Structure formats: C-alpha cells, structure tokens
Amino acid sequence: SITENTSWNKEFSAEAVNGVFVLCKSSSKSCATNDLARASKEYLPASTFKIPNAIIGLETGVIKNEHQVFKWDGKPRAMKQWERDLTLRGAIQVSAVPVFQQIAREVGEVRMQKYLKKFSYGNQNISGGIDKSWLEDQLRISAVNQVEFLESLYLNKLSASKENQLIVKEALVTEAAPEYLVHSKTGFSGVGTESNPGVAWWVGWVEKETEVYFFAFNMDIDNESKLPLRKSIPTKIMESEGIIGG
Amino acid sequence: NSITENTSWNKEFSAEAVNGVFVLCKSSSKSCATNDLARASKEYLPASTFKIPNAIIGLETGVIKNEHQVFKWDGKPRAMKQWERDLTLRGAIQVSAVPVFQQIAREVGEVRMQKYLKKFSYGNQNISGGIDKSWLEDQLRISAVNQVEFLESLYLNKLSASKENQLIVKEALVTEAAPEYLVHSKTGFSGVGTESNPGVAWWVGWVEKETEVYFFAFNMDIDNESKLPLRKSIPTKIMESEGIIG
C-alpha cells in the first residue's frame, strides 16, 4: 500500500526541486510518497547501479572475495578520488565508475542480463548502467523498484548467496551508532540540459532501534550546486517522521 | 618474533598513571607492536568483549534464529535502564545488554559453549564466568594477543562458523563508517573490583583505512569508573600517532 502525502511537497517546493521521495516502514507494503506518478517513473540508476553490479560480481566470482583490492594502474581516471587502490567498500562509497566498468566487462552481457532479470531490476535493459549512454532505451529504474530491491537485499532474499548479500550490505553502511544504522548509496547521471535534465539519487534503509525504514529519493538536476539536496530533502522528511540521526 | 615492544608507547599510560597494554597489528597478527610484552599475553576477564563469540555461537546453534531477531524486553527490571527495551542483535551488542546474552548462553548450554570456545581458541576456554558474574580464580580469561588473533580470524571469516554468521556479527560490530574509514570495535568493563584486585576495561577491534587493516586490543586496570574514558582515549592517541585517524 502506498499513500500520497502532498504535505511532503513542501521540502521540494522550498528548494525549487522536481523530485520524489518514497519512504516505507518495516516492508515495501507500507509506504508514503509526495508524488505517486513519479514514484513509479523509471530513471537512469547512475551509481545506484553499483549495488546490483557488486552482487553480480561476487555471484559470478569476478569479485574473488570480500577483501579483494582493486589496484589503480596509474592511468588517468575521470575523478581524482578514484586514482588510488580501493576495497570493494571504498569503490562503492566513492562511486568509482572505472572499477565497476571492469567488473561488468568480466561478468559480460549474458550474465549481467540474466541477473538483472533475476533481481527484477528496473526495465532490465542491457544498455547504459555503469556505462555512459545517450540511447533512448537503456537501463532505468523507479524509486518504488529501488525500495523493493533494497528490501530484498536487506532480507537476503535476492537470487544470490546470503554471504554475497551480506558483503554488499556492510559495504553500504554510511552511518553507525549503537541504535541507529544507515545503509545508503548516491547517484548522479550528470546535469543533462535545462530541457532534458539529469537525475540524482539517494537510496537506502535506516535501522532505528528495532524499526527499519526503506527509502528512495530522486530529483531532476541541471545545476551541480543542487547535488547536496539529494541527501538534505530526504533527511528533512525522515526527521519530520521521527527518523533522526547524529 | 611477530611482536615488538615499543617503550615509547608507555607515554600515554604514564601521563594518566594507568597500568595497561595496547596491542596494534598491521595487515595480520604477524606484524604487531605493544607497550608491554608481558601484559600483552596476560589473560583478563573478557567482560562484554565475550559478546562477540557469544553472538557467533548463538547464531551457529540456532538459538539466535537469524540476523533479524528482536530480543523482546519482558518488562522485568534490568541492571541498566538502557537495556529496558526491545533490542536487535546489533543493539544488544552495541549497548552491552548482559541479560540478552545470558539468555542466549543459557539456551546454548555449558557443553556447546565449551565446544565452541575450544573451536575458536578463545582464551583459557574456561566454562565459568563469561557473560555470568563470578569471582572464581578459575573462570574465562583472555589476553590482548588472543583477542587480536580471534578478531583477525573473524575479519577473515576463518573461525569455525559459517561465513554468513561471521558477517552478521561483523556488521553488528561496526562503530564508525566513512567512505574509506571503517571501524569494528567492542568495549568491556568487568567492574571496579578492589585496590588490591582491580577490575579490567577493554577496547578491541579493527580499523580498515583505505586498503590497509589494523587489529587492536587494549586493556587497563580500573578501580574508579571516572577512568573509563581512558580505555578509548589512550589507544586512540597511539593509533593517531601511526596515522590511523577517524
């Protein structure tokens, strides 16, 4: 069940942002959103795609184990933060596109296609994903589908070993307090054009005391200065629902 | 052989008039340093650090049904108000909820508890004390070196337990999460004891900084709870002197 809360639009209008937030307590069967239509609309996943990419890398043995170090060969990378050796967690946390492109190359299109179908991941399209593409038809996923996928991961219910799901889960931890734990992942497809904007994401789940909340946020973005809104708008809505971190 | 005594590390102990030991290892237990070789191998009551093997054994035996089990508070008074609430496995470990772990140990039983402490090479492997309060001379005790060996085995998923159960307990131990800085840790305090026979306080864990891993175990004599903060500040100062900063 999903309830539209139009009162949640105030956080978007205050920042002059077009976007959607989906928040669910306990399971994907109890959810609220500011916009029902946009909650089901599919968008480029951008770096949020590193979550299934990492599970598939481990399932296929392309990622040898939890402790594999992805060595920097010294060749130029698009972001300075990627020009270094990275663990699987580090590569996910800094959104290291080149590490995941090499994993996707080794997995191959046949196995990547097979696993996106097994995971019910978005439109399950073979194109884009970890690669930059201007194809009209490429991988896209809705905020509702992100919550469903993340709930499956949280419950170790994806078509993958529980061990591999647990490895990716610890790699996604972004805040740890005794009774407050956040797993999350950002994405940003690029500012696009003023008429054809890019998308920014923040997806994850929060374990507060004995409760769990799943969330997925996306927004249209045509100016990179607006990128921090992908965390501040959802953080404000979650604080209004009593989900408050340190 | 694998451990060097660094007398310079006594600096932070002398400044606080503390009798204690710090063991720090890089990459593995084969490259370590300590301020006191003798105390590094001396066995002390594990106190709440015993919740680490207790949790693994609880999962291995099925007493802890799964990763998502909620330990319900029966409403009966507990020794600390912070324990008078429902707790997850991570919450119970993070707040050192003794009653939750005593009930787990009761269901596991002495025979199985003993069998697993032998499998894990955990301290003197004594059947007495542990999560239960005892003043027996012959009860469970463990050295800082043995804590590092045990935590290294857990980090590597090399304990005699499923890798799934080792991964569940590892996420429950995360205490700091940054993109390229992750800390797993656990405190313990046996109680103030007496001036002639003092209590022991612990801080044990490991730090993943970029692609490096450091294992650590700290213990100190404590006859006044006002000194408890030193169990974290002394090891933090030594680790910061080695560039391990969070």
XYZ file of C-alpha atoms in Angstrom:
492
model
C 0.000 0.000 0.000
C 1.357 3.477 -0.938
C -0.159 6.779 0.371
C 0.499 10.092 -1.363
C 1.387 12.726 1.296
C 1.131 16.048 -0.550
C 2.429 17.741 2.669
C 5.848 16.245 1.725
C 5.936 18.529 -1.361
C 6.849 21.499 0.909
C 10.506 20.266 1.155
C 10.709 20.115 -2.684
C 8.980 23.480 -3.306
C 11.226 25.202 -0.681
C 14.289 24.175 -2.790
C 12.519 24.696 -6.190
C 13.218 20.964 -6.963
C 11.182 18.478 -9.055
C 11.587 15.066 -7.426
C 10.140 12.159 -5.463
C 10.701 10.557 -2.078
C 9.415 7.050 -1.224
C 9.606 6.005 2.467
C 8.398 2.611 3.774
C 8.242 1.312 7.356
C 9.004 -2.400 8.052
C 8.362 -3.511 4.428
C 7.536 -2.240 0.902
C 3.821 -2.917 1.768
C 3.552 0.257 3.984
C 4.836 3.297 2.051
C 4.315 7.028 1.573
C 5.420 9.336 -1.254
C 4.997 13.007 -2.208
C 4.120 12.004 -5.845
C 2.509 8.655 -6.870
C 3.199 9.144 -10.610
C 6.907 9.984 -10.182
C 7.356 7.207 -7.563
C 6.743 4.614 -10.366
C 8.582 6.558 -13.136
C 11.866 4.926 -14.255
C 15.128 6.960 -14.259
C 18.775 6.183 -15.082
C 20.152 4.470 -11.926
C 23.625 6.060 -12.236
C 25.924 4.946 -9.348
C 22.997 3.270 -7.518
C 23.579 0.503 -10.148
C 26.830 -0.365 -8.301
C 24.659 -2.271 -5.772
C 23.462 -5.000 -8.218
C 26.830 -4.731 -10.094
C 28.676 -5.673 -6.840
C 26.311 -8.592 -6.009
C 26.638 -9.939 -9.603
C 30.463 -9.525 -9.462
C 30.555 -11.665 -6.294
C 27.987 -14.242 -7.578
C 29.974 -14.822 -10.818
C 33.359 -14.968 -8.981
C 34.616 -11.907 -10.928
C 34.982 -10.300 -7.457
C 37.118 -13.029 -5.767
C 36.080 -12.216 -2.182
C 35.175 -9.589 0.455
C 38.861 -8.456 0.775
C 39.795 -8.022 -2.924
C 41.834 -4.818 -3.554
C 41.115 -3.042 -6.885
C 44.578 -1.714 -7.852
C 44.939 1.657 -9.645
C 47.127 1.049 -12.776
C 48.220 4.745 -12.709
C 46.236 5.592 -15.907
C 44.108 8.789 -15.669
C 40.574 8.487 -14.193
C 37.666 10.979 -14.529
C 37.733 11.873 -10.769
C 40.901 12.334 -8.623
C 39.141 10.490 -5.725
C 39.338 7.289 -7.892
C 43.126 7.483 -8.579
C 44.098 5.061 -5.780
C 43.795 1.410 -4.691
C 40.230 0.726 -3.425
C 38.489 -2.039 -1.477
C 35.022 -3.179 -2.678
C 33.526 -0.928 0.041
C 35.784 2.001 -0.937
C 34.922 1.642 -4.641
C 31.160 1.658 -3.842
C 31.447 4.521 -1.295
C 33.408 6.856 -3.676
C 31.301 5.764 -6.738
C 34.433 4.529 -8.638
C 32.927 4.039 -12.151
C 36.150 2.539 -13.694
C 36.347 -0.254 -11.054
C 32.732 -1.290 -11.810
C 33.161 -0.991 -15.601
C 35.989 -3.569 -15.371
C 33.776 -5.845 -13.184
C 30.866 -5.505 -15.698
C 33.259 -6.278 -18.630
C 34.410 -9.535 -16.920
C 30.804 -10.518 -15.947
C 29.707 -9.998 -19.595
C 26.288 -9.015 -21.070
C 24.798 -12.586 -20.911
C 25.281 -12.943 -17.101
C 24.519 -9.223 -16.379
C 21.185 -9.548 -18.338
C 20.356 -12.848 -16.514
C 20.922 -11.330 -13.027
C 19.016 -8.054 -13.715
C 16.022 -10.282 -14.678
C 16.540 -12.493 -11.542
C 16.636 -9.285 -9.407
C 13.599 -7.643 -11.155
C 15.909 -4.612 -11.533
C 14.082 -1.794 -13.363
C 13.364 -2.251 -17.093
C 16.204 -4.895 -17.081
C 17.708 -3.235 -20.221
C 21.181 -4.473 -21.399
C 22.432 -0.887 -22.211
C 23.789 2.020 -20.082
C 24.040 1.000 -16.410
C 27.728 1.574 -15.445
C 28.402 2.953 -18.995
C 27.533 6.497 -20.196
C 24.906 6.168 -22.965
C 22.540 8.544 -24.822
C 20.418 5.605 -26.061
C 16.684 6.393 -25.722
C 16.188 2.775 -24.458
C 18.677 1.895 -21.671
C 18.557 0.706 -18.043
C 16.118 2.757 -15.916
C 14.522 2.024 -12.512
C 11.776 3.670 -10.402
C 12.015 4.758 -6.742
C 9.404 2.056 -5.853
C 11.530 -0.611 -7.613
C 14.651 0.644 -5.731
C 12.831 0.165 -2.375
C 11.662 -3.349 -3.417
C 15.214 -4.302 -4.491
C 16.798 -2.880 -1.292
C 14.213 -4.644 0.903
C 15.097 -7.927 -0.862
C 18.816 -7.231 -0.186
C 18.125 -6.359 3.485
C 16.234 -9.693 3.887
C 18.947 -11.638 1.904
C 16.085 -12.656 -0.499
C 17.801 -11.760 -3.811
C 18.806 -14.604 -6.188
C 22.345 -14.719 -4.721
C 24.120 -16.333 -1.731
C 23.341 -14.809 1.681
C 27.134 -14.369 2.148
C 27.416 -12.194 -1.004
C 24.364 -10.104 0.001
C 25.900 -9.584 3.491
C 29.250 -8.498 1.952
C 27.480 -5.822 -0.144
C 25.293 -4.789 2.855
C 28.354 -3.969 5.029
C 29.909 -2.093 2.047
C 26.774 0.169 2.023
C 26.910 1.243 5.722
C 27.210 5.082 5.814
C 26.330 5.867 9.478
C 26.846 3.642 12.549
C 25.631 4.476 16.089
C 24.616 1.940 18.814
C 20.852 2.072 17.927
C 20.979 3.983 14.571
C 22.424 2.356 11.421
C 22.147 3.685 7.842
C 22.865 1.797 4.608
C 22.768 4.141 1.607
C 24.006 4.905 -1.894
C 24.011 8.080 -4.015
C 23.809 8.526 -7.787
C 24.132 11.422 -10.262
C 23.715 10.883 -14.043
C 25.073 14.370 -14.977
C 23.323 17.816 -15.329
C 21.952 16.894 -18.834
C 20.314 20.014 -20.407
C 17.821 22.589 -18.984
C 15.084 20.879 -21.113
C 16.456 17.290 -20.623
C 17.795 17.319 -17.018
C 19.928 14.691 -15.283
C 18.828 12.716 -12.220
C 20.299 12.497 -8.719
C 19.506 9.684 -6.258
C 19.810 8.757 -2.613
C 18.553 5.255 -1.734
C 18.952 3.007 1.291
C 17.455 1.982 4.596
C 17.612 3.069 8.243
C 17.578 0.708 11.260
C 16.428 2.832 14.244
C 16.113 0.833 17.494
C 14.109 -2.275 16.324
C 12.382 -0.500 13.351
C 13.506 -0.478 9.681
C 12.636 2.170 7.065
C 13.411 1.780 3.341
C 13.823 4.907 1.227
C 14.446 6.085 -2.313
C 14.837 9.693 -3.443
C 15.368 11.080 -6.922
C 15.373 14.631 -8.321
C 15.821 16.403 -11.674
C 19.174 18.238 -11.634
C 20.524 20.750 -14.188
C 22.971 22.544 -11.801
C 25.654 20.586 -9.869
C 25.392 23.089 -6.929
C 21.974 21.448 -6.127
C 23.517 17.941 -5.672
C 23.540 18.004 -1.793
C 19.691 18.294 -1.904
C 19.642 14.545 -2.739
C 20.516 13.970 0.959
C 19.098 17.134 2.628
C 15.490 16.846 1.291
C 15.065 13.158 2.295
C 16.887 13.800 5.614
C 14.379 16.587 6.444
C 11.326 14.414 5.511
C 12.708 11.493 7.566
C 13.392 13.831 10.546
C 9.712 15.001 10.305
C 8.702 11.287 10.626
C 10.913 10.947 13.759
C 13.786 9.176 11.909
C 16.707 11.308 13.285
C 20.475 10.546 13.054
C 23.578 12.071 14.720
C 59.224 -12.606 16.785
C 55.887 -11.223 15.405
C 55.587 -8.589 18.222
C 57.914 -5.625 19.007
C 57.820 -3.832 22.388
C 57.642 -0.035 21.752
C 58.617 1.510 25.125
C 57.693 4.960 23.643
C 54.010 3.800 23.724
C 54.166 3.929 27.577
C 53.963 7.784 27.215
C 50.102 7.952 27.164
C 49.883 5.390 30.054
C 52.356 7.242 32.370
C 50.618 10.625 31.712
C 47.366 9.083 33.125
C 49.052 6.810 35.766
C 47.360 3.795 34.052
C 48.516 0.134 34.244
C 47.517 -1.314 30.860
C 48.524 -2.744 27.486
C 47.881 -1.835 23.847
C 48.491 -4.359 21.029
C 48.360 -2.960 17.459
C 48.987 -5.064 14.319
C 49.024 -4.085 10.630
C 47.650 -6.445 7.900
C 47.869 -9.525 10.201
C 48.790 -10.795 13.708
C 52.322 -11.496 12.291
C 53.246 -7.743 12.347
C 52.468 -6.260 15.793
C 53.685 -3.793 18.434
C 52.841 -3.337 22.136
C 53.929 -1.144 25.075
C 54.312 -4.250 27.340
C 55.130 -7.794 26.031
C 54.344 -9.456 29.404
C 50.906 -7.831 29.857
C 50.078 -8.386 26.133
C 49.999 -12.187 26.845
C 48.388 -11.927 30.339
C 44.779 -13.240 30.454
C 41.981 -10.993 31.864
C 38.193 -11.353 32.277
C 36.727 -10.578 28.798
C 33.592 -8.868 30.204
C 31.329 -7.582 27.350
C 34.023 -8.405 24.725
C 32.746 -12.003 25.274
C 29.519 -10.979 23.469
C 31.427 -11.419 20.149
C 31.909 -15.238 20.452
C 28.555 -15.474 22.358
C 26.756 -13.937 19.312
C 28.549 -16.217 16.790
C 27.741 -19.310 18.919
C 24.096 -18.157 19.320
C 23.732 -17.956 15.513
C 25.664 -21.235 14.865
C 23.394 -23.204 17.271
C 20.146 -21.568 16.008
C 19.461 -20.070 19.492
C 19.656 -16.710 17.653
C 17.079 -17.647 14.959
C 18.528 -15.241 12.358
C 20.128 -11.833 11.693
C 16.739 -10.020 12.151
C 15.727 -11.481 15.549
C 14.302 -8.884 18.004
C 15.077 -9.622 21.707
C 11.848 -8.528 23.453
C 12.030 -6.887 26.909
C 9.667 -8.821 29.282
C 9.132 -5.613 31.351
C 11.038 -7.072 34.370
C 13.698 -4.718 35.870
C 17.234 -4.842 34.345
C 20.555 -3.587 35.840
C 20.692 -0.641 33.354
C 17.715 1.416 32.036
C 19.382 1.399 28.554
C 18.574 -2.383 28.446
C 14.849 -1.962 29.330
C 13.650 -2.041 25.698
C 13.381 -4.392 22.697
C 16.842 -4.795 21.076
C 18.156 -6.114 17.759
C 21.284 -8.319 17.778
C 23.334 -5.222 16.866
C 21.575 -3.108 19.528
C 22.160 -5.738 22.229
C 25.906 -5.922 21.358
C 26.292 -2.109 20.990
C 24.670 -1.338 24.424
C 26.358 -4.383 26.099
C 22.944 -5.874 27.125
C 24.132 -8.592 29.596
C 20.610 -10.096 30.194
C 20.064 -10.726 26.435
C 23.385 -12.626 26.186
C 22.860 -14.539 29.459
C 19.578 -15.905 27.999
C 21.402 -16.837 24.743
C 24.176 -18.596 26.771
C 21.516 -20.442 28.881
C 19.856 -21.829 25.694
C 23.253 -22.758 24.123
C 24.231 -24.579 27.365
C 27.660 -25.209 29.011
C 28.545 -28.287 26.825
C 28.072 -26.435 23.483
C 29.515 -23.129 24.815
C 32.679 -25.082 25.870
C 32.889 -26.887 22.472
C 32.828 -23.559 20.555
C 35.325 -21.739 22.843
C 37.736 -24.640 22.096
C 36.995 -24.394 18.319
C 37.676 -20.606 18.484
C 40.848 -20.959 20.665
C 39.172 -18.344 22.906
C 41.362 -17.563 25.944
C 41.751 -20.246 28.638
C 38.469 -21.770 27.244
C 37.086 -21.976 30.838
C 33.372 -22.980 31.217
C 32.795 -20.444 34.104
C 32.191 -16.650 34.160
C 31.983 -15.139 30.654
C 28.543 -13.398 30.467
C 27.792 -14.572 34.069
C 29.234 -12.648 37.087
C 31.739 -14.844 39.031
C 34.650 -14.139 41.445
C 36.230 -17.602 40.802
C 40.019 -17.525 40.222
C 39.436 -20.227 37.539
C 36.979 -18.606 35.060
C 37.129 -17.444 31.415
C 40.096 -15.075 30.801
C 41.758 -13.953 27.518
C 44.902 -11.980 26.584
C 45.127 -8.928 24.300
C 47.222 -11.044 21.842
C 44.485 -13.749 21.828
C 41.785 -11.066 21.226
C 43.734 -9.854 18.145
C 44.133 -13.458 16.836
C 40.387 -14.108 17.356
C 39.316 -10.800 15.701
C 41.698 -11.433 12.766
C 40.050 -14.863 12.264
C 36.600 -13.160 12.359
C 37.743 -10.445 9.891
C 38.958 -13.223 7.503
C 35.790 -15.397 8.066
C 38.252 -18.113 9.246
C 36.527 -19.003 12.560
C 34.913 -22.483 12.777
C 31.466 -20.995 11.953
C 29.523 -20.203 8.745
C 30.787 -17.132 6.834
C 27.145 -15.852 6.942
C 27.183 -15.861 10.792
C 30.649 -14.214 10.921
C 29.411 -11.479 8.509
C 26.219 -10.884 10.598
C 28.302 -10.384 13.763
C 30.804 -8.163 11.896
C 28.088 -5.707 10.767
C 26.779 -5.670 14.390
C 30.298 -4.507 15.490
C 30.613 -1.502 13.102
C 31.106 1.644 15.264
C 32.335 4.184 12.656
C 31.586 4.289 8.916
C 33.161 6.750 6.452
C 33.790 6.110 2.709
C 37.441 4.983 3.261
C 37.487 4.549 7.080
C 35.574 1.717 8.794
C 35.895 0.683 12.474
C 34.647 -2.565 14.057
C 35.013 -2.421 17.847
C 33.733 -3.596 21.226
C 34.179 -2.350 24.807
C 34.185 -4.289 28.087
C 34.440 -3.492 31.819
C 34.493 -6.266 34.486
C 33.635 -3.857 37.372
C 35.772 -1.647 39.732
C 36.934 -4.687 41.822
C 39.290 -3.666 44.713
C 42.589 -1.685 45.047
C 44.477 -4.987 45.702
C 42.484 -6.859 42.961
C 41.427 -4.332 40.260
C 38.790 -4.595 37.513
C 39.722 -4.582 33.795
C 38.420 -2.368 30.947
C 38.807 -3.348 27.255
C 38.592 -1.808 23.805
C 39.174 -4.314 20.955
C 38.527 -4.235 17.219
C 39.993 -3.432 13.836
C 40.247 -0.407 11.519
C 40.028 -0.536 7.696
C 41.720 2.694 6.468
C 41.826 2.906 2.642
C 43.140 -0.604 1.668
C 45.015 -1.254 4.973
C 43.679 -3.113 8.061
C 44.896 -2.669 11.664
C 43.879 -5.046 14.500
C 43.929 -3.739 18.067
C 43.326 -4.814 21.658
C 43.575 -2.520 24.698
C 43.077 -3.381 28.365
C 43.754 -1.462 31.586
C 43.330 -1.881 35.352
C 40.418 0.264 36.640
C 39.448 0.915 40.323
C 37.369 4.090 39.571
C 34.725 4.410 36.769
C 35.941 8.040 36.230
C 38.933 6.430 34.390
C 36.708 4.506 31.869
C 37.069 7.144 29.059
C 40.828 6.283 29.011
C 40.028 2.804 27.515
C 39.288 4.679 24.221
C 41.441 7.874 24.526
C 44.813 6.081 25.187
C 44.547 3.630 22.221
C 43.104 6.460 20.028
C 46.195 8.638 20.760
C 48.594 5.738 19.909
C 46.683 4.900 16.695
C 46.609 8.611 15.667
C 50.449 8.652 16.128
C 50.503 5.868 13.427
C 48.314 7.914 11.023
C 45.203 5.819 11.873
C 42.840 8.845 12.330
C 38.995 8.786 12.133
